[PDB]
Amino acid sequence: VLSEGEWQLVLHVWAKVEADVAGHGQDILIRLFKSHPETLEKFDRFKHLKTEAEMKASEDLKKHGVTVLTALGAILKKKGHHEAELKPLAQSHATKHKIPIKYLEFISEAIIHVLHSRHPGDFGADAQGAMNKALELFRKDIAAKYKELGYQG
Ligand code: HEM
């Protein structure tokens, strides 16, 4: 599992995310959409945005970034005891939203990219390994729930 020392690395940088949840949400979602355009087509709410400036100017997009980060945070502060938290999320993402596991890999990479950009003194290799570990545990757990439900395995 993550060691206590790994968990402290993850939560130290996540407390700096919290100082600007909206801004980090925006940057994470923009990166995802520009690097992996197919992901934007999942969002009836956002599929009209074509350019990076249009994405930056959308207030609703910045709201959904907060939604996302606020749920991610709540999961992380459980330190792996996130069964309750995860269960509604994998349920909607398998059945309603239909989000492949691979696209959760891609938002994982955009999280780490942004955190590197924003927090390089608090996001050395040590903390980057720890963050990667904690995002891989989130994906493993959700993947287990998708399998159970019979969504892309
Ligand atoms: C850190 C990873 C992610 C977290 C914590 C997250 C969290 C959430 C939450 C809390 C909601 C609203 C409640 C719900 O319907 O469950 C939501 C909705 C949604 N998410 Fe996720 N999500 C993540 C990744 C993704 C990815 C990678 C995509 C697409 C590529 C996606 C697509 C959606 C869509 C389409 C909605 C509904 C938005 C709307 O129409 O209101 N999510 N997400």
Curated annotation (Swiss-Prot):
Impact noted for substituting G121A: In metmyoglobin
Ordered alphabetically, the record's keywords are: Cytoplasm, Heme, Iron, Metal-binding, Muscle protein, Oxidoreductase, Oxygen transport, Phosphoprotein, Transport
Q: Where does heme b bind?
A: H93
| Annotated residues for binding of O2 | H64
Residues recorded as bearing Phosphothreonine in the entry: T67
Q: What is its EC number?
A: 1.7.-.-, 1.11.1.-
Keyword match Metal-binding: yes
Does the UniProt entry include the keyword NAD?
no
Residue positions, PTM Phosphoserine: S3
Tell me where it resides. Cytoplasm, Sarcoplasm
Q: Could you list the residue ranges forming a coiled coil in this record?
A: none
At the top level, the lineage of the source is Eukaryota
Family matches, as InterPro entries: Globin, Globin-like_sf, Myoglobin
Briefly state the protein's biological role.
Monomeric heme protein which primary function is to store oxygen and facilitate its diffusion within muscle tissues. Reversibly binds oxygen through a pentacoordinated heme iron and enables its timely and efficient release as needed during periods of heightened demand. Depending on the oxidative conditions of tissues and cells, and in addition to its ability to bind oxygen, it also has a nitrite reductase activity whereby it regulates the production of bioactive nitric oxide.
Q: What is this protein called?
A: Myoglobin
| Protein source organism | Physeter macrocephalus (Sperm whale)
